[PDB]
Paper text:
The best construct with the highest expression yield and biochemical features covers the region of residue 36–351 of EBOV NP (named NPcore hereafter). Both two domains are predominantly composed of α-helices, in which the N-lobe consisted of thirteen α-helices and two β-strands and the C-lobe consisted of seven α-helices. An additional minor positive-charged region is adjacent to the major crevice and is consisted by R205, K211, and R298. However, this hydrophobic pocket in occupied by P protein in NiV NP, but is accommodated by Helix-20, which is consisted by residues from N325 to E351, in EBOV NPcore. In the structure of EBOV NPcore alone reported in this work, Helix-20 folds towards and interacts with the hydrophobic pocket on the interface of the C-lobe of EBOV NPcore to form a compact structure.
Similar to other −ssRNA viruses, the RNA genome of EBOV cannot exist as a naked form, but must be encapsidated by NP and further form a ribonucleoprotein (RNP) complex together with RdRp.
Author numbering: 35 to 122, 127 to 138, 144 to 256, 262 to 325, 335 to 350
Amino acid sequence: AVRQRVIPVYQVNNLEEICQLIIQAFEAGVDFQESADSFLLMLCLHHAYQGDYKLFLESGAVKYLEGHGFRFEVKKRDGVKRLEELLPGKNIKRTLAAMPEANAGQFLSFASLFLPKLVVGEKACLEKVQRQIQVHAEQGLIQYPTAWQSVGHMMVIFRLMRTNFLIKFLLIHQGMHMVAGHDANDAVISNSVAQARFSGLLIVKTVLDHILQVRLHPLARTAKVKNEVNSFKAALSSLAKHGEYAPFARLLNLSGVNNLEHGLFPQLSAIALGVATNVGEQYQQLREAATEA
């Protein structure tokens, strides 16, 4: 973890125009490889920071990433009219060269719809997106282009979200840190991020909600389940290190999250099921209940 992930930050006077090209390319499923991060960042820069590079670079998003394995490199690029001109191989330039209804905010809010069920699989995730689109449409909150509501387009964005850390991180951060009087796209993003809390971490949510009482639920005090309580406590201690991102650890593939796999805790899960029918703070609460047992 000594070596950093380096992300070029392309500074253009063209940003809205370049974002339209970026959106067009992602829709066509262009495989940007190592450059995808840089182009997704530019969308976030335009939408969340009103194109203000200085404020983006001193933002809490960037401060966190710089402290956790990333380095950002500003490259000033005057006179760019085509994405090809920002590419730092062979076939991507051809694809972009062949390039002949929305905006960056819309692209990002649509992408955020994939967060709540991303880790559950394509079928479940796409069904969730379709239902959410109809909810937002009925509340009059947002409407997406005709082209984006095909199963085919959703499969493209699903794969983009599944594989790209930075866009998930920036959406999640945005969802927790909006500027006053936020717009419809930000409302959708913040809603998506709220829905995504503890996605892929069912055992954490349910243990903290149903087994925590503070003491452990009486069924979680037996010596038979003591191995599971100890294992959970250790795993939760490590999760708490991720601070406000802990509920999203499975979404963001953060360290130590494999230790919280559901299957690793059958006895606690069974207890939680019987009952039902920040993270740093709750770890301290769990520490307290455990010690008492």
